[PDB]
């Protein structure tokens, strides 16, 4: 999961 | 500028994020957004014009920030939904299973349901804990944006998602989406902010  | 949840703003003339919610802290106007969007004192612009600066932020650990605005800005109790608006009525936290929508400058207004609370995201920078997960989709640029029920109860601000190579998780079924937001209530009490409602 990544920022956004 | 009119400050409406969901709209684009830039940070130091480089990254983009979306406005979460209009708030006040005594006579100061501001909006809450995601912590990862900017550092303290970064310049925020809406439509090429300076609207305010990052007053405080916490990222990673948590993912929250509020931008203090100049007094020329017009704070509005509203979140963008296409050419329409959702009025902000309060901040009652919805339970898992409840339906919720989110608004941002990249994918617009998207709805889904809350699937879990107290999720940890392990981002490149460090973990962020205590996030709520929904399955509404979102894309790069939607950070900071509003998560709100149709009923007008502000849930939190967009933090992160399981992004695919197209820049969003809108092309995978809802079942496979992990769209995470930072809860609003801790941000409001931590900075002593009150939400603008209508």
Q: Is the domain B77-183 a CATH 3.40.50.1860 member?
A: no
Q: What technique solved it?
A: X-ray
**If you compute the radius of gyration of chain A from its CA atoms, what whole number of angstroms results?**
4
Rounded Cα distance, B145 and B28, in Å: 21
Resolution in A, one decimal? 2.2
Joined together, the tokens standing for residue B97 give: 């299973």
Query: Searching chain A, which residue's CA lies closest to the CA of residue B177?
Result: A1
Instruction: Give the residue among B25, B24, B26, B44 at the shortest CA–CA distance from B34.
Output: B44
Rounded Cα distance, B189 and B110, in Å: 27
**If you compute the radius of gyration of chain B from its CA atoms, what whole number of angstroms results?**
15
Rounded Cα distance, B37 and B143, in Å: 7
Largest CA-CA distance found in chain A, in angstroms, rounded: 9
Instruction: Give the residue among B85, B80, B114 at the shortest CA–CA distance from B100.
Output: B114
Strands B21-25 and B15-18: unpaired
Instruction: Give the residue among B23, B4, B44 at the shortest CA–CA distance from B188.
Output: B23
Cβ contacts of A3 on chain B, cutoff 8 Å: 34, 36, 63, 123, 125, 143, 159-160
Residue ranges of chain B that CATH labels 2.40.10.10 = 3-76+184-196, 77-183
Cβ contacts of B123 on chain A, cutoff 8 Å: 1-3
Rounded Cα distance, B183 and B180, in Å: 10
Largest CA-CA distance found in chain B, in angstroms, rounded: 45
Chain B nearest CA to A3, separation (Å): 4
Q: How far is CA B82 from CA B6, B16, B79, B108, in A?
A: 10, 19, 10, 7
Q: Is the domain B3-76+184-196 a CATH 3.40.50.1360 member?
A: no
Query: Searching chain A, which residue's CA lies closest to the CA of residue B33?
Result: A4
Asked if B121 contacts B132 with a C-beta cutoff of 8 angstroms, the reply is no
Contact yes or no for A3 and B122 at CB 8 A = no
């Amino acid at each position: 999961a990544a920022p956004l | 500028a009119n400050i409406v949840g969901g709209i684009e703003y830039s940070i130091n003339n480089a990254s983009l994020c979306s406005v979460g919610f209009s708030v006040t802290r005594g006579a100061t106007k501001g909006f809450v957004t995601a912590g990862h969007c900017g550092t303290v004192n970064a310049t925020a612009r809406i439509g090429g014009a300076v609207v305010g600066t990052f007053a405080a932020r916490v990222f990673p650990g948590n993912d929250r920030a509020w931008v203090s605005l100049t007094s020329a800005q017009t704070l509005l109790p509203r979140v963008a939904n296409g050419s329409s608006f959702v009025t902000v009525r309060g901040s009652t936290e919805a339970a898992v299973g409840a339906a919720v929508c989110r608004s941002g400058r990249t994918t617009g207004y998207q709805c889904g349901t809350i699937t879990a609370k107290n999720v940890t995201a392990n981002y490149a920078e460090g973990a962020v804990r205590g996030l709520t997960q929904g399955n509404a989709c979102a894309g790069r640029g939607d950070s900071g944006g509003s998560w709100i029920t149709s009923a007008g109860q502000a849930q939190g601000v967009m933090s992160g998602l399981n992004v695919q190579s197209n820049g969003n998780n809108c092309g995978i079924p809802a079942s496979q989406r992990s769209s995470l937001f930072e809860r609003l209530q801790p941000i409001l009490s931590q900075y002593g902010l009150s939400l603008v409602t209508g």
